[PDB]
């Protein structure tokens, strides 16, 4: 409201703002800067937030279930539990943020880079992580089913044995260590 | 008929004896020492041949379909042809055999000793190779198809990436290599 008009103001740089719990449903915040503020329990569902900056910025239950993030800078960002529901991550900078378990069923991660992210029992449930950079990331208890991880890169990441039954795997690149995991995970013996 | 008569009297060795294209159909030979018998086409569909010795006989286009071949010692036989649909191969001495496009479609090979035998192009289609010793067989271009390898050792045996799309694989014993392999057979990139 008092924020919207300061975005229509041509003003780009909000930093630390604590916004906890507001309602911006598909609000258009582009290429703004977001960086730290405090969000926690926000509802953003189809927000427009390309190119934002999101980095350190706490997250934790918001709803940005269709939100749109391509591009954007979430390094570090605290998604606790949020819900992503058919949000559009393509090609966001996911770094080292933590989504555990965050709910991101039918999200588009293609081409984002995860690595050293914290997807801890996440949702990945039928969503694309087409040319993810994984590498690194922990990927424990995480829900695979219908998961696309084609292309992605694996290399580092730790993930459970019903990963390897379950994402799509065609061209995931994967240490050795990580095709004997995959090859034990359908249960032949080493 | 006359060698039937032989049978029936006790004598239990028959060593090189030329049978080209007889009917056996359903006969008794079990414990007889077959070794070195020229076979070829025989008819011996359904005999009974347990424990036999059948080592370096030519058997190439004989049709043993369900033969009973259980324990026999079929070492280094020529079966390269054979149709063994529905035969049973329990526990039989199969070492280095030769079994190219052998017909081996719902046989019995549970618990058989094949390491070194060579099943190029053969018809593994719904035939139970469960806890059979493989190691360094050849299966190139063999017909895997609904096989069951459950248990079975693979150790050395060269087989193509469609066996690892195929075969049940659960229990098999695997190289490191050959597990690497599996993987790629189904995408996953090194």
């Not at 390309?50 to 910025?57: C, E, G, I, T, Y």
């Not at 694996?154 to 994967?174: E, F, H």
């Amino acid at each position: 409201g008092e924020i919207l008009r300061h975005y229509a103001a041509g003003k780009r740089n909000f930093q630390h703002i604590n916004l906890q719990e507001i309602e911006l449903t598909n609000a258009s915040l582009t290429g703004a800067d977001l960086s730290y503020a405090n969000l926690h329990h926000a509802n953003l569902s189809r927000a427009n937030l390309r190119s934002a900056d999101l980095r350190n910025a706490n997250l934790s239950h918001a709803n940005l279930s269709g939100a749109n993030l391509e591009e954007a800078n979430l390094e570090a960002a605290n998604l606790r539990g949020a819900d992503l529901h058919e949000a559009n991550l393509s090609g966001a900078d996911l770094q080292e943020a933590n989504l555990t378990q965050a709910n991101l069923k039918d999200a588009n991660l293609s081409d984002a880079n995860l690595e050293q992210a914290n997807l801890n029992n996440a949702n990945l449930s039928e969503a694309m992580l087409t040319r993810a950079n994984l590498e690194q990331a922990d990927l424990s208890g995480a829900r695979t089913t219908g998961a696309r991880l084609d292309d992605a890169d694996l290399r580092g990441a730790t993930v459970d044995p019903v990963l390897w039954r379950t994402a799509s795997l065609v061209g995931a690149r994967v240490d050795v260590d990580q095709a004997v995991a995959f090859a034990a995970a359908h249960g032949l013996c080493l």
